[PDB]
Amino acid sequence: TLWLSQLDIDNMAGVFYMLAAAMALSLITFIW
């Protein structure tokens, strides 16, 4: 013994996931 914050990239990944989910949901409206 004697001698010897804020958001991150995964937040952007979650943003991408929710954007993809929103696009998938909106595809039904788009085709309709």
């Binding site: 914050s5 804020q6 958001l7 943003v15 929710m18 954007l19 929103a22 909106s26 039904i28 788009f30």
Partner: protein
């Protein structure tokens, strides 16, 4: 009797035109006893040394007055010409462990008794006798003592990125309007910021719900980080601090002069590297070191705990660090042939037992936004004027367009 200059204990001031000092009363209403004390005007070398009589007072002189009253002593106050506590130092004649400063003056026969914050030391005790200490104190360090980045501590571009997110939804709402205008972006800006702004409605609701949850998640991440985390930047733990154990030019720390702290460091041969850097930052007296610490010349100044805490109480900009080490107590140093040792010890013990030391401590020792939100308040206040000015400009432009 000779004494050394110490602001918490021995206040020394120039005399008035009559050779005395102003008669003043303390905060408690008790008279402030002061005496005429002989000493050099400037103890530093290379100065026009004049032995003008100053006026000195404080806790030490009050204890001296009490001792004189209890023992019929006719004290003659003197100031150390050397300006240092003094110890065994080699100046010339090769091997010469001769005491200098206050100790040397006492041994030379010029001084008969010493009343001063003189830390009890074994080497001093070899040739001098210390009475019962009137107080107990150790050694500490003195050092000058988070949410300024209100927007972002790092990666300030995020404010833009989330703003871009508004776009990636605003153009969306227009598209649903085309395959079913201009307020989509305004509503996206003002959905979380409350300001009163077939399947298309469902898609709008779900997309804005996702945007709102993303925004609140980002806000919670930003604000929850600003929490109980330590605001001070690596306060010195004490003598066991690894930074002190590893001397460097970036972080310098040293004592004042060859005082009892210097003798303790000399005895502790473990801190050999500490001595080398310590010898380069010595100061004439404690006041110069305190000023340098206040001026940030010294990162930290190691000195007696009582003096450091008194200065911290008087000057709030500097704070004390370290718990306790080299615990000792101030005492009266007398020559071995002095027969007053028992009398002085008994008087000091009786005074400390009867509460006189408490009165002395009370009279002398015992004494008494920013960029977190003001920055954003200033920003919004400045922006309001520009906003109302541009509102007036655009109203005038609309009126001109309507008139044409």
């Amino acid at each position: 009797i000779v004494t050394i200059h110490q602001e918490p204990f021995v206040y020394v001031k120039p005399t008035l035109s009559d050779g005395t000092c102003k008669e003043e009363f303390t905060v408690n209403g008790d008279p402030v006893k002061k005496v005429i004390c002989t000493g050099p005007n400037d103890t530093s070398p290379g100065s026009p040394r004049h032995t003008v009589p100053q006026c000195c007072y404080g806790f030490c002189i009050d204890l001296l007055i009490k001792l004189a009253r209890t023992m019929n002593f006719t004290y003659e106050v003197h100031l150390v010409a050397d300006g240092k506590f003094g110890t065994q130092e080699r100046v010339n004649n090769s091997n010469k462990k001769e005491w200098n400063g206050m100790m040397g003056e006492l041994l030379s026969g010029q001084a008969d008794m010493i009343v001063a914050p003189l830390t009890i030391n074994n080497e001093r005790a070899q040739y001098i006798e210390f009475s019962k200490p009137f107080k107990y104190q150790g050694l500490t360090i003195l050092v000058k003592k988070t949410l300024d980045s209100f927007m972002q501590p790092f990666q300030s571009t995020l404010w833009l990125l989330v703003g871009l997110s508004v776009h990636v939804v605003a153009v969306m709402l227009y598209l649903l309007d085309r395959f079913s205008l201009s307020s989509a972006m305004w509503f996206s800006w003002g959905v979380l910021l409350n300001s009163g702004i077939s399947f298309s409605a469902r898609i709008l609701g779900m997309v804005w719900a996702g945007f709102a949850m993303i925004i609140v998640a980002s806000y919670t991440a930003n604000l929850a980080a600003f929490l109980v985390l330590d605001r001070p930047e690596e306060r010195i733990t004490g003598i066991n601090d690894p930074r002190l154990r590893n001397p460097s030019d970036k972080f310098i720390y040293a004592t004042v002069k060859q005082s009892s702290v210097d003798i303790y460091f000399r005895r502790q041969v473990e801190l050999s590297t500490m001595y080398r850097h310590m010898e380069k930052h010595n100061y004439e007296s404690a006041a110069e070191a305190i000023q340098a610490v206040r001026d940030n010349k010294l990162h930290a100044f190691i000195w007696d705990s009582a003096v450091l805490e008194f200065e911290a109480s008087q000057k709030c900009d500097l704070v004390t660090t370290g718990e306790l080490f080299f615990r000792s107590g101030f005492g009266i140093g007398m020559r071995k042939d002095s027969p007053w040792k028992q009398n002085v010890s008994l008087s000091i013990l009786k005074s400390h037992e009867n509460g006189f030391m408490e009165d002395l401590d009370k009279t002398w020792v015992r004494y008494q936004t920013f960029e977190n939100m003001a920055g954003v308040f200033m920003l919004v206040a400045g922006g309001i004027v520009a906003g109302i000015f541009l509102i007036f400009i655009e109203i005038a432009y609309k009126r001109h367009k309507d008139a044409r």
